[PDB]
Amino acid sequence: SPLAAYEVDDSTGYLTSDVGGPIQDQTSLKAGIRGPTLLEDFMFRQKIQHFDHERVPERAVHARGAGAHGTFTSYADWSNITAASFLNATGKQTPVFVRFSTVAGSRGSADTARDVHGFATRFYTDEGNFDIVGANIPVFFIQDAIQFPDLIHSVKPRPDNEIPQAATAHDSAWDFFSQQPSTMHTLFWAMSGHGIPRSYRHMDGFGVHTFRFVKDDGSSKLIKWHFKSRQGKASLVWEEAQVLSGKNADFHRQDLWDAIESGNGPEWDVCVQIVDESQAQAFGFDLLDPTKIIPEEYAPLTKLGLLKLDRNPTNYFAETEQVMFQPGHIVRGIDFTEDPLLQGRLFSYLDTQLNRNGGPNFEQLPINMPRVPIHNNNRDGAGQMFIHRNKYPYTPNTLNSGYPRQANQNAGRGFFTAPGRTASGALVREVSPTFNDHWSQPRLFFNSLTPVEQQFLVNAMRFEISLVKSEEVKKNVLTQLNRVSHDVAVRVAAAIGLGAPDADDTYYHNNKTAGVSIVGSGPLPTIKTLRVGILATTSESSALDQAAQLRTRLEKDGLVVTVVAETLREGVDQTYSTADATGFDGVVVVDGAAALFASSPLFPTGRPLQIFVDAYRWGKPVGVCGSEVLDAADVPEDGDGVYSEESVDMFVEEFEKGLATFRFTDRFALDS
Amino acid sequence: PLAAYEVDDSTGYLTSDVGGPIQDQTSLKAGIRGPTLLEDFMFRQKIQHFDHERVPERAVHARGAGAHGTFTSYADWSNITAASFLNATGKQTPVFVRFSTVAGSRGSADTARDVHGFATRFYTDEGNFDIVGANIPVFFIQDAIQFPDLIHSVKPRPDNEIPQAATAHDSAWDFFSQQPSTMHTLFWAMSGHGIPRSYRHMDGFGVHTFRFVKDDGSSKLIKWHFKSRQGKASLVWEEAQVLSGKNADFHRQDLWDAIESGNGPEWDVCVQIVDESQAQAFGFDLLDPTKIIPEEYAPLTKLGLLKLDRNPTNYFAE
Amino acid sequence: SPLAAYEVDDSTGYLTSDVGGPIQDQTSLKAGIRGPTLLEDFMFRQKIQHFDHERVPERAVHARGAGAHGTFTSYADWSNITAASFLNATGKQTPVFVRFSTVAGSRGSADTARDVHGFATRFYTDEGNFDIVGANIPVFFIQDAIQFPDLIHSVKPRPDNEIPQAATAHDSAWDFFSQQPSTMHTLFWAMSGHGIPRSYRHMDGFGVHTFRFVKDDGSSKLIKWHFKSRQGKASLVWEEAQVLSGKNADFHRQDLWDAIESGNGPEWDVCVQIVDESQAQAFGFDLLDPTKIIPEEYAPLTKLGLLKLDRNPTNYFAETEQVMFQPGHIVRGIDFTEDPLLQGRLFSYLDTQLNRNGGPNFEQLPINMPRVPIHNNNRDGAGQMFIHRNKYPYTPNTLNSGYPRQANQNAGRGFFTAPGRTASGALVREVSPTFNDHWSQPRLFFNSLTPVEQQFLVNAMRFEISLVKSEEVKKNVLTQLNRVSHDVAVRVAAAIGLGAPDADDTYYHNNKTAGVSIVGSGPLPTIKTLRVGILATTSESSALDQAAQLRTRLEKDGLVVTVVAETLREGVDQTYSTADATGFDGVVVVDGAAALFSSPLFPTGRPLQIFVDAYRWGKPVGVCGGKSSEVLDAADVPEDGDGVYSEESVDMFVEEFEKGLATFRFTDRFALD
Ligand code: HDD
Ligand code: HDD
Ligand code: HDD
Ligand SMILES: [Ca+2]
Ligand SMILES: [Ca+2]
Ligand SMILES: [Ca+2]
Structure with missing residues (x-):
């Protein structure tokens, strides 16, 4: 070679x-x-x-x-x-x-x-x-x-x-x-x-x-x-x-x-x-x-x-x-x-x-x-x-x-x-008339997403179009979205305070197609490589203990486990100061650490809880192993993709199913 | 200021670069659903330009932003320097300034933790004069031959090109710990100076000792200090990281907005001036660029005003 | 490799x-x-x-x-x-x-x-x-x-x-x-x-x-x-x-x-x-x-x-x-x-x-x-x-x-x-004054050339300087040359119609050094690779045989031989149309070819002109076969000139001609001031 x-x-x-x-x-x-x-x-x-x-x-x-x-x-x-x-x-x-x-x-x-x-x-x-x-x-x-x-x-x-x-x-x-x-x-x-x-x-x-x-x-x-x-x-x-x-x-x-x-x-x-x-x-x-x-x-x-x-x-x-x-x-x-x-x-x-x-x-x-x-x-x-x-x-x-x-x-x-x-x-420098339908397939695509994916898409548009300074360009955008779907144009316009134009059904239909939706394509077929952050503490030998045992059972299945504490030491991979929920596909608080979640010179104020709340709001599997802590978060103990178990094995087993599901989409608000 | 090179496209028909009116929306094809023709010069001249738009980024300071302004001298400084832009009270010289981080590529975030550049061109009546300076008054190393060693260590590891715009990795700290000259710049970079609120809220330094030279041949040693009139201000780290994601363009936008609103940033351009015989008088060597001269030992003399007040027309060209 | x-x-x-x-x-x-x-x-x-x-x-x-x-x-x-x-x-x-x-x-x-x-x-x-x-x-x-x-x-x-x-x-x-x-x-x-x-x-x-x-x-x-x-x-x-x-x-x-x-x-x-x-x-x-x-x-x-x-x-x-x-x-x-x-x-x-x-x-x-x-x-x-x-x-x-x-x-x-x-x-951006003498060593060099070499040098100067349009520049050139040798300035001045300026002898001397003269470094220590052109003819079966015999003998000593004739055939390497005296260090005419010395196959006078150019440029030249006076007289080349050869015998011809190739150039053939 x-x-x-x-x-x-x-x-x-x-x-x-x-x-x-x-x-x-x-x-x-x-x-x-x-x-x-x-x-x-x-x-x-x-x-x-x-x-x-x-x-x-x-x-x-x-x-x-x-x-x-x-x-x-x-x-x-x-x-x-x-x-x-x-x-x-x-x-x-x-x-x-x-x-x-x-x-x-x-x-x-x-x-x-x-x-x-x-x-x-x-x-x-x-x-x-x-x-x-x-x-x-x-x-x-x-x-x-x-x-x-x-x-x-x-x-x-x-x-x-x-x-x-x-x-x-x-x-x-x-x-x-x-x-x-x-x-x-x-x-x-x-x-x-x-x-x-x-x-x-x-x-x-x-x-x-x-x-x-x-x-x-x-x-x-x-x-x-x-x-x-x-x-x-x-x-x-x-x-x-x-x-x-x-x-x-x-x-x-x-x-x-x-x-x-x-x-x-x-x-x-x-x-x-x-x-x-x-x-x-x-x-x-x-x-x-x-x-x-x-x-x-x-x-x-x-x-x-x-x-x-x-x-x-x-x-x-x-x-x-x-x-x-x-x-x-x-x-x-x-x-x-x-x-x-x-x-x-x-x-x-x-x-x-x-x-x-x-x-x-x-x-x-x-x-x-x-x-x-x-x-x-x-x-x-x-x-x-x-x-x-x-x-x-x-x-x-x-x-x-x-x-x-x-x-x-x-x-x-x-x-x-x-x-x-x-x-x-x-x-000729002419466009074939067979290319003229610009709107039917974007519609087909939108029709094929789940309701939570449709909302994500509308929300991505609302976010971007709201940053467009030109009111002429905004109106031109709604005109185009409207030809794909009236409903997308009404929802996007709500956020930028303009009126959608009137439905123009020329390219509307109800057809769906398989294989274009992320949520509709099921649980992941493998969770190997996915990332679990275990929030723990040095002030508690029980915390590092619970962390070590989770680590064993999670690394067992090819998960990449990071143990987070206030300072580095044997068994701890990351300090809170450098941890973030964007670094994990799932977050686990060991109950031994209840106290970090109610100030420290070693990490920004509220950092331990912020990670957990971030993780929850972004739809990740989160849970507590060993509760009360779920109160401090305001995270409901009965929500889908929230786990709380005294037993390590029951916890990991349920938590791994969360990882496969990957995102809990019930946590996101849909338009009426 | 660069008016004479401006090109106006607010009217007219599309032409080639040689003035032939053309179109540029559809390729020439053999039949309406046929293959594209090699004889389509309209297509090839356009795509060729596009294919060749990029030029190499700067080897360091790739990420940066710049603006036009004016330097106004406060005095006739002939008694310290024959420099002509400094030779009459009120004398005005066009400038262009570019600020930057050091280690990140183009596209990287404005609010990485880094040293920053602060480069100023004075378009003087006796030639362009450039001070290629820094937000931080001392540099990491004591010999220019070591520069690629510093930069290789602080730039991304070369097998995978990770991490972008950050000293937070093994190679950089290996270098800092083996090359102890780096300590001074390292401390400044680890302070709030590594994360300024804006380009407008930092100072500028020449770093090196230079000389002022009179028309009679006599010289003095000088350090350049550009002292911000907006004050100094820093982000906190946790906010700098979030901002790096929410708005990668934060400093360039800040600067651009300040100029468009009539709030163009200003610096007093100053020097510490000392005698040739003082080269080793302050307990260190004035040739050594890891050292400052504490203001207790040599105060600042204010020479003039630097005001940035005009955004470029074309970022690339300028 | x-x-x-x-x-x-x-x-x-x-x-x-x-x-x-x-x-x-x-x-x-x-x-x-x-x-x-x-x-x-x-x-x-x-x-x-x-x-x-x-x-x-x-x-x-x-x-x-x-x-x-x-x-x-x-x-x-x-x-x-x-x-x-x-x-x-x-x-x-x-x-x-x-x-x-x-x-x-x-x-x-x-x-x-x-x-x-x-x-x-x-x-x-x-x-x-x-x-x-x-x-x-x-x-x-x-x-x-x-x-x-x-x-x-x-x-x-x-x-x-x-x-x-x-x-x-x-x-x-x-x-x-x-x-x-x-x-x-x-x-x-x-x-x-x-x-x-x-x-x-x-x-x-x-x-x-x-x-x-x-x-x-x-x-x-x-x-x-x-x-x-x-x-x-x-x-x-x-x-x-x-x-x-x-x-x-x-x-x-x-x-x-x-x-x-x-x-x-x-x-x-x-x-x-x-x-x-x-x-x-x-x-x-x-x-x-x-x-x-x-x-x-x-x-x-x-x-x-x-x-x-x-x-x-x-x-x-x-x-x-x-x-x-x-x-x-x-x-x-x-x-x-x-x-x-x-x-x-x-x-x-x-x-x-x-x-x-x-x-x-x-x-x-x-x-x-x-x-x-x-x-x-x-x-x-x-x-x-x-x-x-x-x-x-x-x-x-x-x-x-x-x-x-x-x-x-x-x-x-x-x-x-x-x-x-x-x-x-x-x-400093100053020149050391130890560098200031620009003329003594060019004078030393000039002195170490033989008189004919000195003539060539003067002639190269006359050739170039005569093509300078500016009379000021030409004057300025005689001024410098004059600081090296009054004699060089006089002789160059003569070509261009200007007086040399008055002798200025600050830098004149009579000193000589070894090993800078080409014409004085004796004969070449080897003639291998040197190029011999044999002019010959297809009209005569015997010119091509003299050329072949002559080729064999010369090639034995590692010389590069070209037989030239009206047209190519076995044993002929080049036509007169393509041959020139610049392609050879020595030129021999086989006396079977005397008659060539007008055709559609080469420009008028080409064969003679090859021999005449070779002679005029100082090359060893000669005639082989034994009858020489017709070639030599057509060319205005005297039979007893140094570097001019005539012999019936191939063996004898070559031994003498090879001495000429080692001498390489016969300088007696160029005029002096
Ligand atoms: C006529 C211009 C043009 C058009 C219509 C396209 N591209 Fe392209 N593409 C380029 C001109 C180009 C380029 C300027 O030629 C690049 C930049 C660097 C390179 O090697 O080619 C390139 C790079 C590039 C790369 C990066 C290859 C790499 O990793 O280095 C990918 C993956 C694509 N393109 C994919 C596409 C797809 C899927 C297209 C439409 C179906 C497409 N390009 C249309
Ligand atoms: C010998 C290598 C070397 C050394 C020791 C330095 N630099 Fe440098 N600098 C370069 C080699 C370089 C360069 C590779 O030549 C750059 C990259 C792009 C360019 O134009 O020059 C440059 C770019 C550059 C820029 C960007 C200018 C712009 O916006 O276009 C600034 C502000 C500096 N440097 C400042 C410094 C300071 C304050 C130094 C220490 C006192 C320093 N450089 C030492
Ligand atoms: C300051 C510039 C400069 C100066 C004062 C000189 N040269 Fe030079 N020379 C060059 C700049 C140069 C060059 C422009 O850099 C070249 C052209 C291409 C290259 O490789 O270098 C070059 C080419 C070059 C070549 C060709 C090498 C090859 O075959 O590729 C030779 C033999 C010389 N030079 C020899 C000399 C001698 C004997 C000099 C005086 C003693 C001299 N040069 C002074
Ligand atoms: Ca824009
Ligand atoms: Ca590294
Ligand atoms: Ca000329």
Whole structure:
């Protein structure tokens, strides 16, 4: 692997320059012990110059992200449906690297911003690198790639003052959304709990676009990729996401890192929906339109293989920061479609790597290299790392005996465009009328959420739109929401004191679809990796005792347990001063600690109780082991997802069921 | 002030960068549901610009915000310096100032605990003069060659890039404990100075000793102190953490709002002035940037007024 | 080959993208057979994007040059003068790479422009890469690095229209020279035959600056680097260099390439003049002044080892174009001096690579990699190839156990600055007055040339100065030349119609030094690789047999023979249409071909003109077969001239002609003032 070969060991040895000369790097060379630094200090300059040049431009979108290595294993020989080599035998294994991201934030912005998320997977196949550069959400904001800068400028900070960071909660974004109705579907996904997933591990992946699978005989079918999480899906609530941004801006990347270090590497079933070419407009919308999903009732999933992430990078810059994905990295057996969003994307990713890398040889970075030989006539360019032995790099040649040979459908396993694809008509800059329904699928989506999820979504909109200064933009927003659902527009307008416009039922209906709701998708299928905070005290040997015994029984099931006390000591992991409810999926107070919950120089006033109340209001399983304490909280002993038991075993057993349920949604007020 | 470079887009038709009127909402396709054409220059010039919008962030002080203002001299300071912007009572010079945290990337929160930069350009009639200063009057280290060691230790661990904008991790404290010069800046950073209420409520320092040089050749040693006229004020930690999440832009918004409401922040720009012969007279070395000269030993002389009163037009360009 | 690890083989296999996907690259994807090209065609865009970005900026100076790999072998254990590890044992071998170049011309400009030349050597030592970035001439134009852009602007093309390419023959250069008299020394070397060397292999190498040798005990001595050519020194004549520039702009790079390919890799003795610290001002001038040589009479050379170039690159762009030399690549045992031209160079070489490479990681290019492990805390930056395991890249640390360790004089074989070096005084932008004599050494140089060499030098000056438009500049030039030698100013003045000014004898003397004269360094020590052209004819079966016999005999002694005729056939290498006297060091006509001396197959008079040019440029020429007077009379070449040969016998002809090839140039054939 080109990664092993380029690993550099510094665990022994003397400091050297980049050209291998042993040196020191701690004192500048000076004329006299109190004199000025000398230009001839090469040691100073080579070190500072490296440091001066360490940064590269951040990605234009998806700048905040993290990745990991893993493996993809095919479940079957899929030759009946695609020629793709990585899919051509049962048990066939391919190395992968995945990077997850938000969209709008710059590289230091918080993981738990409300946003759409990237899910980019590189398969290093035996017939070349194949990238699926996908999302946590199956539909996108716009219908033509040429609009991407427009969308992105509106959602990124206003350019006079560069405010606000990583947020659609400002005028320009809502102006664009309200002026460009195609945005509604993704908008509804982004405003639901999908905008604030619990972790990268608890989100699906989607290729968004229709692609083709192409067989060796040249026949082809239309496909949508769906990466289906084995950890189940989960979100934060918004008041929790906000606090988390401040307390742990690295929440998602730490979650991914830690799960992999503990042998809980995340898994997804890689699936396709697969349909015939003739069904391009059969489902009541156009499969070239990336704002639409094919409901599962219309085309079920076929499982192809298992994606597992199971090793962290060695150097984040060299691997995560430098990985350069491109939908143009395609392999024989896969082909594009005439999705006008997909089509322009092919151009952008090849071009943008010149900006990041500063030079044309970016496919030579080790993370970008393939796992097979490279035979082509590309030459020179800044940062050329190969030494080519073919001095006759042109086709046709006889001087290198005609090598490299052309690869195509009938030679060298060449890529080939699906040979039934055709084009006809005028050369136009016109939008197909088949793309015009912007509102029926956002409605379908909303209809498919539970009542508490619908409320969350309305509340996300009320929160954002209330921060829009322009009263014109606010009214324009309500006009658009109203075409999806009168009821959403009445509820959102209540909060901003404007009147919804009159119901306009053109795009209304009652249809629902499966697999789009987080709460409706059940208890989590595993609670491993989930986090339990046990609030305890040093003033009481019984407290640390009860804590230790819970720890045993909770760590038993693969929960990450943190014991919190006023000060560190054996058995205590975190002080109250640094603890927060955003740090746990469940909070347990050991009754031995009743007294912290009625001042201290060691932590902010009311910190112990605040954690517990926060946890409760945000819907987490909370409880007391050993009561009265539930009074101090004002937390009802008979509420769902509130546990109080004298027995450790009965407590843990009930509490684990709470963890699976994950959120107690009865704690949230619904509109009338 | 930079009027001559401004570009007005409040009217007109869309053009290319070479003035050809064009559209930019739909790609050119072979047929209405067909593939996009390579000959669509409108599409490629637009996406190419977008693909190349970003430039590398600053290696340190990536997160920051800036504004235009005026420096007004209080006196004719020719008897201490030949510097021309300081040479007549009331003399006015345009400035631009950028404030910042040190360790976080672009996007990180304004109210991380950090040292802060306070950089001022004076566009003088004898050339640009820059004081690239700090909210804290002393720096962590005593030799420039050690800078990448400091910054690598305080920036996120390089295997996973965790934690963002925070000294709260092993590498940084390992460095602080092995490099005892760091103690002075460390104490200031751990105080309320690490979490100012606003850019307007902190002071600015040159940190280094410099020289003033007269037209006759004689010099003096000086430290620059910009003394805030808004007063000093800090957050408390627990509030700074919450604020970092509720409003990552808190200091830039504070500054921007103060200027738009007529409340542009002001500093008195001062120096401690001492003789060449005093370089070691105060019980430490004036060349040593981990040290202050206690005001008991050399009082501040006020040279002029710094007022920031104009927000930029384009954050990126400015 | 030392860079085998990075080689890419394309002698078999199917075309792929840079990411391994097999593809085609001959036809674009179109909507229909006569339709427009599709944006989705990634095969097209990856291929054209690469091509669109193949170029990097050429070097700011020395843009035009050529390189080869080789070996350095130490003749001894040099620990008695230096701690340098590549010099620590008899027969110790170190891979090198060397690049030779001109200075002013762009990429593409002609090898045989009149110029100073670069001679840059990398030693990939077991203690780090060490570069000697030197010259063919021992002295530089200017005494302070800060003046480099002024020198280079004045000698480069004028910036309104970019004329003239690779030439000092224009007003701005001579304005600079006349206003900046430190330039005189280097200017006299450039105007001599050293400005137009016969090949890279026939020139010497110089460090220019005084450096220090430092022993492991911290004592030091001052050194000058001299690389003495084992092929001998040889120049072209100006009228020939000019024709060559147009007939073969690749002359020196081809000469080098062919020499290595035929097993005749060029060699140099790498030497030093060594002197004590306390002799910095003992020789009549300042050793910190890069415009001065230590005459050999005062400090003899010590031979340190053998430099041999014996392997051409595989990819010119990857190896020669990308090699990035720096005097900052220094190794323990060597140190800098306070030469102000050297001091500033340290800065420029590190900085200019950011320009060429477009990013900070240029030392990771294969050609620039060291041959030993790298342990340091430099990280990230564009194009980062390494994946560093150490997650605590700062010092001091405990979390990586204090590694990498600091290296210095007493631990880890660290570089260290010579401990005896000091500075004292005010911080100044003043020139030392010890640097003020700009004229005595150019005069010393002029005196050590033979009378014909002196004529060539005067003629190079007349040629260039006559092309200066400005009469003021021309006057100002005679003023400076006049301070060197009244005689030079008189003789140049005559060409341009101006009086020389009155003798000014402050700096005149009659002193001479060894080893700076090309024409006085005796005959070449070897003639292998020298080029013999045999003019012959297809009309006569017997001319091709004389040519074959003559070929066989000459090739036996390692000479490169070209038979020329009207048309190619077995045994004929080149047509008259392509042949020129610049392609040969010697020209023989086989007397079966006397009749050629008009056709549709070559320009009128071409065969005769080859012989006449060869004679007029000082080459050995002759006629073989026994009947000579018809060729010789057509050419106006006297039968008894030195370097003119006629013999019936092949054996006898060659023995005499080979003496002429060693003499190389017959200087009796050029007029004197
Ligand atoms: C025409 C412009 C354009 C359009 C329409 C899109 N993108 Fe994109 N995308 C970019 C232009 C781009 C980019 C500017 O080219 C980026 C920035 C850095 C890079 O490598 O490419 C990028 C990066 C990028 C990344 C980060 C890859 C990584 O982790 O480095 C993901 C996951 C996506 N995009 C996903 C999408 C999805 C699911 C899209 C719509 C379905 C989409 N992009 C449309
Ligand atoms: C030799 C390395 C080094 C050392 C010892 C310092 N700095 Fe620095 N500084 C840089 C290297 C640097 C830099 C890498 O060159 C930066 C990053 C971006 C830039 O323009 O310069 C910079 C940026 C920078 C900025 C941001 C300016 C802006 O807003 O654009 C400020 C305020 C400072 N520095 C202030 C300081 C102070 C008060 C120092 C100690 C007295 C200090 N620096 C020591
Ligand atoms: C202050 C600037 C400066 C000064 C005073 C000099 N040079 Fe230089 N030289 C450069 C700045 C430079 C440079 C701009 O940095 C180059 C261009 C590309 C590079 O690598 O460095 C260079 C290239 C360069 C090369 C080409 C190396 C190669 O083949 O790649 C040689 C042989 C020399 N120089 C030799 C000299 C000699 C013998 C000098 C006087 C004794 C000299 N230089 C003074
Ligand atoms: Ca806005
Ligand atoms: Ca750490
Ligand atoms: Ca000129």
